[PDB]
């Protein structure tokens, strides 16, 4: 009831990358906690940005988002209804959908996007926050199995980063493990034909 002293949350902030440009994939930090609390607040961000998938932290959690179609995409889960900071200052997210677990943002510049994969393939590839790349088998629409189970501590934080196909097009953007005791042995995604119709919406 006391409006003058209601804080505001601040806005997701891009630290770093996971870069797939080379014949190696590695994590690259590109702020650390200080300049991210401050960003978070201010909503300012003119660090240079690249690649396809964004390593993106709040003043709580960090995970991933990743760019297709022009569009920075992440879960709900993350980043609720935050602003995304940006070099002009925070930018509000233009698709918000706590059904599907998606949100996203205009993808900021010098960002690169995926393709949507039109490839219909079953032979997938989870991309972490540590850059691994996990081969997955499609088992349906929003799911894949694990080839090879981790402990669920292994995809923690990487929520908002791609599944891909093959040839590298986006399949989907993972959201949440399929777990048993603590074991994940298969994984849920928002498929890329979601995030196509919530463009049209
Ligand atoms: C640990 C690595 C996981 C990727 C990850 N995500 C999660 O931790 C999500 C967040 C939350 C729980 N969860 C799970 O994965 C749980 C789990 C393992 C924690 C036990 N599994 C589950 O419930 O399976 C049940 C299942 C039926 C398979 C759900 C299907 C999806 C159904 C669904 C549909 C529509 C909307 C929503 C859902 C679920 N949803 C909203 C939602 O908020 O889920 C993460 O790394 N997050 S993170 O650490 O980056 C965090 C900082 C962002
Ligand atoms: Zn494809």
């Known amino acids: 009831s006391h409006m003058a002293s209601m804080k505001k949350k601040g806005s997701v902030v891009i630290v770093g990358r996971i870069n797939l440009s080379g014949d190696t994939a590695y994590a690259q930090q590109t702020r650390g ?7 978070s607040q201010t909503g300012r961000d003119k660090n240079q940005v690249e690649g396809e998938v964004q390593i993106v932290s709040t ?12 569009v920075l995409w992440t879960v709900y889960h993350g980043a609720g209804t935050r602003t995304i900071a940006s070099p002009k200052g925070p930018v509000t997210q233009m698709y918000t959908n706590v059904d599907k677990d998606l949100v996203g943002w205009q993808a900021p510049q010098g960002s690169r ?12 590839y989870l991309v972490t926050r540590h850059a691994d790349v996990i081969p997955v088998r499609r088992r349906g629409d929003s799911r894949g199995s694990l080839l090879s189970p981790r402990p669920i501590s292994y995809l923690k934080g990487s929520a908002g980063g791609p599944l891909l196909c093959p040839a590298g097009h986006a399949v989907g953007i ?14 849920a995604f928002i498929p890329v034909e979601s995030l196509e119709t919530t463009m049209r919406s």
Not at 33 to 39: H, K, L, M, W
Not at 59 to 70: C, E, Y
Not at 174 to 187: D, I, L
């Open 33 to 39: 906690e200080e300049g991210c609390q401050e960003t």
């Open 59 to 70: 003043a709580t959690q960090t995970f991933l988002a990743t760019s297709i179609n022009g």
């Open 113 to 124: 996007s995926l393709t949507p994969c039109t490839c219909g393939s079953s032979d997938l």
């Open 174 to 187: 993972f959201r949440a493990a399929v777990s048993t005791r603590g074991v994940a042995k298969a994984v």
